[PDB]
């Protein structure tokens, strides 16, 4: 092989690997329990469903019948 080119890809590997060694270690530090996951809309199902059944017999405030 050509000694000049062989010795040059050798430099690109290291320069690229010393400065490339940071990206993957950031994923390993990602929290498994995200910040405020219960805030995520998928977890607030009852907050959006229950108002739709708030007038259903069986879960009404007793005074709602007296005024309606």
């Amino acid at each position: 092989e050509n000694p000049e080119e062989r010795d040059r890809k050798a430099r690109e590997h290291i320069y690229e690997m010393h400065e490339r060694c940071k990206k993957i270690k950031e994923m390993w530090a990602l929290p498994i329990r995200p910040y405020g996951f219960w805030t995520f809309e998928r977890h607030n199902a009852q907050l959006r469903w229950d108002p739709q059944i708030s007038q259903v017999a069986g879960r009404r405030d007793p005074y709602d019948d007296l005024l309606e």
Binding site: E1, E5, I14
Partner: protein, 269 residues
Amino acid sequence: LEHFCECYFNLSGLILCPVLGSIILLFIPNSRIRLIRLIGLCASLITFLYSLVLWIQFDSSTAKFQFVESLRWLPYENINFYLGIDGISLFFVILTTFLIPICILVGWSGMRSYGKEYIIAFLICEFLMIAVFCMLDLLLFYVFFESVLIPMFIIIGVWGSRQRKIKAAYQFFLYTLLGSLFMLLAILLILFQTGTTDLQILLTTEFSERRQIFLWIAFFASFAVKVPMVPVHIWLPEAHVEAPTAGSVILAGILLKFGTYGFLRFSIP
């Protein structure tokens, strides 16, 4: 980074030769004993000549790794693996390629009863051992060294002379696997610092004296079993005696060298 070499004869084809021989032999009936014998012998001889050519184009002035080529594993390219040799590994590739045809020739007379399984096992051993000697990565060095245990186990157990081959094969497998697991622990220990297993990078990172001591102990656990060093040498007499002749040749001439190669290649530098 694709590190593809420019030379025509490279490492990957020398890896592929005995693999292709094994696949072809998979499908040839055991009645065609002559064809099986000739195909195995010729594949091994072509691999030997290929290694001789690799010697010819060796450059004896550089401290770098020569004929370096790369093989991608994932499209993410976080983990990418390299093969390459130097002046410490070249002659071991040559010795492996030279010894394998000798093994096929030693069992020439008994091949009618040996079958194609004998030649296939030795060709697979050849492929795995050449890979081991040609790896610029701790993890792949691990993976391909452990792989030789399976065909070596089969070689000792099936074509050994007497029933002591049972105990010999068990002990060979278990001792070698224990050492290998120790060096797997060392590999993971290294990966946690560096985030990589590429040999070239590890040659340019600085390890603390303390963690150098402990990683060296973990490497020593594998290598001293491999060498062998006392008192973990007792598997060797049993295994090297009970194995068939060609099995003993491969065990003593190549497999024993893997511990000293590991000392030269990872532990000392």
